[PDB]
Amino acid sequence: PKPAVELDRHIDLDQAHAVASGGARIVLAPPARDRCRASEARLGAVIREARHVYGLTTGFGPLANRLISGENVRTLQANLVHHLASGVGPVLDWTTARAMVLARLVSIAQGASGASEGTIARLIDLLNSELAPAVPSRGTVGDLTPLAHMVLCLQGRGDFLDRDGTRLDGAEGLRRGRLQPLDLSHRDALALVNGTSAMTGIALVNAHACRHLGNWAVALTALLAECLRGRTEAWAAALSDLRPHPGQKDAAARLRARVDGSARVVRHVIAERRLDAGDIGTEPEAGQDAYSLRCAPQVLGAGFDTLAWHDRVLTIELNAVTDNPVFPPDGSVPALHGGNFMGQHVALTSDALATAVTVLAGLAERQIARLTDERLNRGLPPFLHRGPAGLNSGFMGAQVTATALLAEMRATGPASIHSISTNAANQDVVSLGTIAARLCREKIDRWAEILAILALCLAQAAELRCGSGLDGVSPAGKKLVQALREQFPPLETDRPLGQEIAALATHLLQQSPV
Amino acid sequence: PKPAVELDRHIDLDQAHAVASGGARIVLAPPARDRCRASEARLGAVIREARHVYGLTTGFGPLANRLISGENVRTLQANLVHHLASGVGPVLDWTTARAMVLARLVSIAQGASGASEGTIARLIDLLNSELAPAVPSRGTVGDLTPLAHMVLCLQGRGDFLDRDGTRLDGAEGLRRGRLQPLDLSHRDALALVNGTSAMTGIALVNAHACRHLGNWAVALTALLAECLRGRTEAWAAALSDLRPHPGQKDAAARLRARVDGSARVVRHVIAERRLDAGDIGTEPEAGQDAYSLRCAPQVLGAGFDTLAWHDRVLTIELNAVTDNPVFPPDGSVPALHGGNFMGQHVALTSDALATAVTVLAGLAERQIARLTDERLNRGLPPFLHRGPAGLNSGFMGAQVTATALLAEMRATGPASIHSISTNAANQDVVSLGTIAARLCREKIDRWAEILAILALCLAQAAELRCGSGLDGVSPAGKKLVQALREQFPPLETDRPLGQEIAALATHLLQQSPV
Amino acid sequence: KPAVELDRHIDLDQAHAVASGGARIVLAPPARDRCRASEARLGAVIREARHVYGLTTGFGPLANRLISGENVRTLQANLVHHLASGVGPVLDWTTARAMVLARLVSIAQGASGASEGTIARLIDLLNSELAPAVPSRGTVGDLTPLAHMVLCLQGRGDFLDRDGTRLDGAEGLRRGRLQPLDLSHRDALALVNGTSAMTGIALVNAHACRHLGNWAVALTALLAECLRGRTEAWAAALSDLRPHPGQKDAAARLRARVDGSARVVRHVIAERRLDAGDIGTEPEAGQDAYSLRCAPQVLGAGFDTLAWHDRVLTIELNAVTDNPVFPPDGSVPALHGGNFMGQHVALTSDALATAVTVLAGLAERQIARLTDERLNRGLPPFLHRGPAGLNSGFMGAQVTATALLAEMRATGPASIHSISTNAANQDVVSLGTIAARLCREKIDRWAEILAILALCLAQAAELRCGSGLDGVSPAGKKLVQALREQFPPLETDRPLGQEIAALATHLLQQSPV
Numbered sequence A, B: 001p002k003p004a005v006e007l008d009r010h011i012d013l014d015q016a017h018a019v020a021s022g023g024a025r026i027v028l029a030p031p032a033r034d035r036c037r038a039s040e041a042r043l044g045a046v047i048r049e050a051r052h053v054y055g056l057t058t059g060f061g062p063l064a065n066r067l068i069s070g071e072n073v074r075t076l077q078a079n080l081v082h083h084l085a086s087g088v089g090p091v092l093d094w095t096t097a098r099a100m101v102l103a104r105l106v107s108i109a110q111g112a113s114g115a116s117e118g119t120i121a122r123l124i125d126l127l128n129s130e131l132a133p134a135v136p137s138r139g140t141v142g143d144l145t146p147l148a149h150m151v152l153c154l155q156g157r158g159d160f161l162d163r164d165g166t167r168l169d170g171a172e173g174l175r176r177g178r179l180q181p182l183d184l185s186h187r188d189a190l191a192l193v194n195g196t197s198a199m200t201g202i203a204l205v206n207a208h209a210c211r212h213l214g215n216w217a218v219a220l221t222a223l224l225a226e227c228l229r230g231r232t233e234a235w236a237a238a239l240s241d242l243r244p245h246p247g248q249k250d251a252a253a254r255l256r257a258r259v260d261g262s263a264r265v266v267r268h269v270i271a272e273r274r275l276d277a278g279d280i281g282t283e284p285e286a287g288q289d290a291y292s293l294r295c296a297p298q299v300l301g302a303g304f305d306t307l308a309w310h311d312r313v314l315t316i317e318l319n320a321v322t323d324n325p326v327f328p329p330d331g332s333v334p335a336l337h338g339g340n341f342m343g344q345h346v347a348l349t350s351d352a353l354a355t356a357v358t359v360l361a362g363l364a365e366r367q368i369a370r371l372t373d374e375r376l377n378r379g380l381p382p383f384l385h386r387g388p389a390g391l392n393s394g395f396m397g398a399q400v401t402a403t404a405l406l407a408e409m410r411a412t413g414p415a416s417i418h419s420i421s422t423n424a425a426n427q428d429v430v431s432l433g434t435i436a437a438r439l440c441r442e443k444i445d446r447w448a449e450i451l452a453i454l455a456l457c458l459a460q461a462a463e464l465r466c467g468s469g470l471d472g473v474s475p476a477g478k479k480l481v482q483a484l485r486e487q488f489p490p491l492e493t494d495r496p497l498g499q500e501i502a503a504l505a506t507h508l509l510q511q512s513p514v
Numbered sequence C: 001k002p003a004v005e006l007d008r009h010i011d012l013d014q015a016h017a018v019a020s021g022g023a024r025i026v027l028a029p030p031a032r033d034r035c036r037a038s039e040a041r042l043g044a045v046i047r048e049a050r051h052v053y054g055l056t057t058g059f060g061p062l063a064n065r066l067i068s069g070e071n072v073r074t075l076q077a078n079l080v081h082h083l084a085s086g087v088g089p090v091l092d093w094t095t096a097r098a099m100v101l102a103r104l105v106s107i108a109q110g111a112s113g114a115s116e117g118t119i120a121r122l123i124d125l126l127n128s129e130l131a132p133a134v135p136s137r138g139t140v141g142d143l144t145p146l147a148h149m150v151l152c153l154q155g156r157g158d159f160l161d162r163d164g165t166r167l168d169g170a171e172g173l174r175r176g177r178l179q180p181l182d183l184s185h186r187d188a189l190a191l192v193n194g195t196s197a198m199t200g201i202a203l204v205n206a207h208a209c210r211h212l213g214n215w216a217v218a219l220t221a222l223l224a225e226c227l228r229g230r231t232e233a234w235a236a237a238l239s240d241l242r243p244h245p246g247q248k249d250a251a252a253r254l255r256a257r258v259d260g261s262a263r264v265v266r267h268v269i270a271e272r273r274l275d276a277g278d279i280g281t282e283p284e285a286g287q288d289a290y291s292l293r294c295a296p297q298v299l300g301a302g303f304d305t306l307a308w309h310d311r312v313l314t315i316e317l318n319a320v321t322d323n324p325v326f327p328p329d330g331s332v333p334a335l336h337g338g339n340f341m342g343q344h345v346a347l348t349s350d351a352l353a354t355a356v357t358v359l360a361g362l363a364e365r366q367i368a369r370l371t372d373e374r375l376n377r378g379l380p381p382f383l384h385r386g387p388a389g390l391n392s393g394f395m396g397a398q399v400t401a402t403a404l405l406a407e408m409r410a411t412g413p414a415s416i417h418s419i420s421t422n423a424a425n426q427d428v429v430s431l432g433t434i435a436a437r438l439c440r441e442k443i444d445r446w447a448e449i450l451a452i453l454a455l456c457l458a459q460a461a462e463l464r465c466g467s468g469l470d471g472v473s474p475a476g477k478k479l480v481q482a483l484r485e486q487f488p489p490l491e492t493d494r495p496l497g498q499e500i501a502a503l504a505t506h507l508l509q510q511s512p513v
C-alpha cells in the first residue's frame, strides 16, 4: 500500500519529504485534531467579542490603522488574497509546492492559528492527492504572495500541477483530485496566508536533495581513488579523531566503507617504510595525493556540518508556528501580535548551505578536471576516450561543461544581504528567505549535473583502468558502475552526452548509490 | 511584404534583431557570395596541399598534437560535433537561438571561414523560416557546445522550436520549415562550430530589449513627475551642458519631451523668486524633489552610456570573424591560428550592462516605493487603492513584489571574474561570455517586470490625481495611459495582478511607449 | 593577572583572554608530559629514518624528492624561507597572538613532536606584551603567516607592541625577554602547519560579535524607549511558538533591557474590544515596523549563526590541524593526510559574515527610522538641537551609516573562489583565512554603524524624556549616562567622525552592563 505519516506535534525532515513527494499519505492525530478544534473556537470568540486583531478588524500592513467593521470581514479577507496574488515567474515544482502546503499545515497543527476543520481538511486532501497547486516562484520578500496563490488554487481559481508538471485548470484539479473548494467563511484566511511556508518548503526539498548528492559525492570520491591508485591513509579514523568535526569523521568513515574490499587503492602507511642511503633520490610520485583526494574528508565534512546546521534550524522552523497574529492555547490573552513570520533563519541557513554546495561542486569539478587530464590521471587516455585518439575526444566536451556549470554557480551569492525597506517603510527589514532557498536550489541542481558528469567519467575510467570486468574494484564500486551501465552505455566512440548528463542528474537528486 | 536585409559585410544591431525575430528576411549580397565562394576554394586548396591546419589535419584541444590523415577527416569532424554536444539546461528562446545562427553567418560572410555554399544556404534557410534550432543554454565557457547542438539540429538530429517555443523533432523541423539536411562533406564543420556566436546572439537580443526598456524608464519617470507635481528645472538642458555626458544629455532631453504640454508638472525655477522677511520659516515642501525624480537624468544617463559602450563593442563583435583557424582572403598564408574565439569583450560588456540594468531597476523600484507611500505621494491614496481603504489595499502586494524582484537581481554578480583553468589546463583562462550575457538577460527580464508594475501604478495614479479624463496630463502621458487601459482595466477593487504584470512585461521588452 | 592553564581544552573566552593579554598562559603538567612523549616519538621517527613529509622529503609536489638526514636542517630552514612571501597590512596585535595561541593549543594535544624549547618560545610570546608582525595576505588556507611568525621568533622579523608600534627583531627579543627560536630538533613542521591564522582571526571575530550583539540588543531596546515601541512583540509566548534558541534569547534579553521602563507600550492590543463608533482611521497602527517588531527574529537568526560558528571554531581551536602527525598510541610512526584544510573556518566565517551584514542592516534601518521626522513620532528631524535648518544634527552621520552598510554588502563569501594551485597539487583550497578576514572587516563596519546608532539614541532619549531621562528604564539610563561620560550631547552641529570611530572601538571590546 502506502506509508502513513500521523501528524501530531513533531514531524522530521524525512517524513516531511515523504509526504511532499507523495511517498506517504498524511493523517492528523486525534490530539492535534482536538487542539485545532479548540483553537477554532478561540477564533470564533475573538471575532464575536470584536477584539482588536490584525486581519479580523483591521486593514493590512500600514493600513492596519484602518479599523474594519465585523460586517465587512468576508470582503476584507477576500481582498487580502486578491491584492497578494501578484506573483510572477516559473511555478514551484510539484514536490516543492506541496512542501509549502505541508509547512503551513504543520504550523496550523500546533493549534494556535484558529483554522477551521474544513480548512485543515482541504490542505490534508491536497497532500493526499496526486496534485500540487501551481504557484509562481517570485514575489515574496519572505511568504504571503505564494500562499495567496495557493489559496486561489484550492478555491478552484488557480491552476494545479500533476507529478509531471502539466497544468490543470482549477475546476479540473478539484475534480480529478476529489478536492472540495476551499471555504473561508469562518474568517480563518490568515491561517492560510501567513508564516514562512514557501521558503520552508523549498528548503526541506533542498535538504533531501543534498543528502542524496552528498552520498554521491562520497561514492564518486571513493571510486576516483580506485581509478587513480589513491592513498587510503589520508582517510584514516585516527586523523578524524585528531580534528573531531562530526561531519569530517562521518565523511572519512563513509569513504573508507566505500573502498572496503578494493585492491585498486594504496593502503600502505608511508611512514612505516624505513629509508636507507640507496633510497635518497627522486621517486616517480609523491607520497601523498593531491587535495581533491587527500582532503576529501575535510572538504566534504565541512559541507556536511553546514547541512547539519541547516537541518537543525529547519526542523525547528518546520514544526513552529510562524503565524501572525496567533491565538495562545492557554487562553492567557485573546491573541498576540508579533513577527514570527520573519524568515531570517531559513534565509541565513539557505545562504550558508548555498556556499557549501558551491564548494562541494567545485571539488567534484576539480575531480573531473584531474581524472580527464592525461598528465595527471596516471596513465589513463586523454579525456578517457576510446577509439583512435584525435579522431575521438571522449569526455573533452563534458569536462568543460562541468567547469561552465560551476562558474555559473559562483556568479550568484547570498540573498540575505539585500534587504530593502519596502511596504511604505513598514517592512523596513525583510529576510528574503524564499529567494535564498530558491538560489540554493539552483546551485543544488548544478551540483547534481556536475556529479553526473563525474559519475559517467568514473564509469568509463574504471573500465579503462581495470577492464570491463572491473578487476580489483571494490564491491561497492562494482555495484555503482554496474548500476550506471544498466542505463548508460560505455563511450566506445564519441557521442552527444547532454541528454544522458541531464537524465543522470535527475536520478542523483532522488536516489543514493547503494 | 516582409522586409529584406541584404548582408554584405556590415549589419547593425537593429537589422540583426529584425532578422533574428523574423521581422525581416536575409539575403547574401553578390559580393559576399563571391567572397565566400573564394574562401570555400581556399579551404579546398589547404586540404589538397595537406597544410598543417587545426581540425583538418589535427585533433582538437590538447589533442591537436595528434596529426590526422586526410582519409579520416570526415570522421574527425563528425566526432567533433559529437563530443561537444554535452549541453544542458533550458533551451535558448526562439529569437536568441536564431540570433546565434545569424552571428555565425555574419562571421562567415566576411569570407575567411571556408564555409561551402550549401552550409551557408542551410543557415540562410533557417533564418528565413519560422523555426529556430533547440539548443541547451548551458555548457560553454565562452561557444562550441551550443553551436554543436545547432549543427545536429540542422542535420535533423536535434529538435527545433516554433515561435511559441513548442518543440518539434528533427524530422518535423526539416519538413515544416522546408529545410535541407546539413551536409558537411566539404569538411567545413569548423565554420559552424566556432567563435562567439551564442554570447553575441544573446547580447544582441539584450541590446534590443534594453533600448525599449530604457524608453519605458524615461516615459514612466516623466509620468511620475506628472503624478507628483515634479519640478522640471532639474531636467533643464543647461544642467546637461554643465556635465556633458551624452547619455545624461539624452536622458534629460527625452524627459523634457515626455512632459511637454503638461500642466501637472512645476516649471518655475525656484531661484527666480525673491524672498522677503515674512517668508522665513518652514514651507510645506522643499524646493527640490527626491532623487528618484531630480537625479533621473544622471542615473538614467549613466545606464544609457553603459548601453552605448556595450553596443559599440557588440557591433564590432557581430561583424567580426571570431573563428579559429581562419583563411586569409588576401592569400598571404594558407591559414592563421590564434584565439579570436575568446569572448572577453562580450563578457565584460555584458557584466557592465547587467550592473547598469540593476541600478536602473533600482531607480524604478524606488519610484514605485515613493508613489505608493501615502506619506510621500503628496495626497494620493495609500498604495493607490480605490474603494474603501483597508478593505482594499490596491498595489500593496505588487509594490513588495517589485522589491523582491530587485533583491533577487542584486544577488547575482558579474560572470567574468570566475574564470577557471579547464580542458587539461589548455584553456587556462576562459571568458564565460555566454554566461555573462545570459545573467544580464535574466536581469533585463526582472527589470521589465518592475517597470510593468510601475506602469500599472502610474496609470492608476494618473487617473486618481487628474481624473479619468487625465486633465492637465501631457499628450505623451495621455497616450501611454490610454494605450495601457486598452488592455489593462483600472483597479477599482483589489484583484490578482500577477498575470497582468507578466503580460505587460512581455510587451515592454518588445515595444516602446509611442 | 589571571592565568589560563592549558591542558587539552580551552574555551573561546579563555583563548581571547590570553590573546588580548588579559591573562597569562601556563601549560599544565599533563600537557607538558604528552608533549615530551611526542618529542621522543619524533626523535625515534628520525632515528629510524621513517619516510615522513618534511623530515625525509621536499615540500608540496617536491615531496617526491627524498632527503638525506644530514640535510634536514637546511631543508626546514628553506621551508620557512620560501614560505615567507606574505604581503599586506600586518595582522593586529591581538589577532597575531591569537594565531600563536592556536598553534600552541594544537601542539599541546601531543601529536606534533614539538620540543620543549619550541613550546616555551610560544608560551613566552603569549606572556609578553608583544606579538609577531605578520603580513595578512598570502595564504590559501596557513603556512605563509606562520613562516613569518617563525622568522619573527628567531629575531629575523618585526614585532608589534600593544599599540601596534613596530620593533625590529633584535629589539623585540630584548624588550619581550624572548629567546631566539631554535629548530635544531627538526620540529619546524610543528610551527608551520595547520589552520592557526584563520582560527586566531576567527576567535577574535567571535569575541567581537558577542559584544556587538549585546549592543545590538541594548540599542534596539533603547530605540523602543525612544519610539514608544510595543513590548508584546517581544513576549516569551511568541518565542515558545517558534523555539529558535537565538530568538528566545534575543527576546528575553530585549524584555530585560526595557524592564522598569515607562516609555514603552505594554498593552496587548487584542485585549481591546471595538465598538461601531471606533471604526475609521486611527492615528497609529497597532503594531510597530519590523526594525522593532521583528528584532527577536532578525537578531535571533544572527545569534544562532554565531552559535554554530562558535561550536565549529571551538572544535577547530582544540584540534590538531597538523600534517604530518605522530599518533600518541604508537600505532603507526606517522600519519599523512589533510587536517590543514581549513574548510570549516571558511564556511562558518562566510556564514557569520552574512549574518553580520544582516544585523548591521537592521541597525542601519533603525537609525534611518529614528532620524526621520516623518517616522520618529514627534522627534526633531535628524535629532538636531538649536534652530532647525541652521542645524542638521545627525543628518550626515545617518548617511555615513548607510555608506558603511552599502560597502559591507559589496563583499561576498570567500570560500567559493577556490582555484587549483601549487602545480595542481592543491587543486582545491579553503581560503578560510581570507574568509575570516573579510568577516572581521564587516564586524568593524557593524561596530561603526552601532556607534552611530548609540550616539543618535543618547540624543533621542534626552529629546524625548528630557536630560533626566524620565520614564527610561534603569538599563537604558545607565547606558546613556555611561555614553555621556565621554560623549557630550549634540546641542549644536559639530564633527562626529572622530567620536564615531572612538565609540566603535569601545563597542568591540565591552558590552552595556
Ligand SMILES: O=C(O)/C=C/c1ccc(O)c(O)c1
Residues within 6 Å of the ligand: A060, A061, A062, A083, A084, A144, A423, A426, A427, B393, B396, B397, B400, C287
Ligand atoms: O506589517 C504587517 O504585519 C503586514 C505587512 C504586509 C505587507 C504587504 C502586504 O501585501 C500585506 O498583506 C501585509
Ligand SMILES: O=C(O)/C=C/c1ccc(O)c(O)c1
Residues within 6 Å of the ligand: A393, A396, A397, A400, B060, B061, B062, B080, B083, B084, B144, B423, B426, B427
Ligand atoms: O585550444 C583549442 O583551440 C581547443 C579547445 C577545445 C576545448 C574543448 C573541446 O571539447 C574542443 O573541441 C576544443
Ligand SMILES: O=C(O)/C=C/c1ccc(O)c(O)c1
Residues within 6 Å of the ligand: A288, C059, C060, C061, C079, C082, C083, C143, C323, C422, C425, C426
Ligand atoms: O601537499 C602538501 O601537503 C604541501 C603543499 C605545499 C604547497 C606550497 C608550499 O609552499 C608548501 O610548503 C607546501
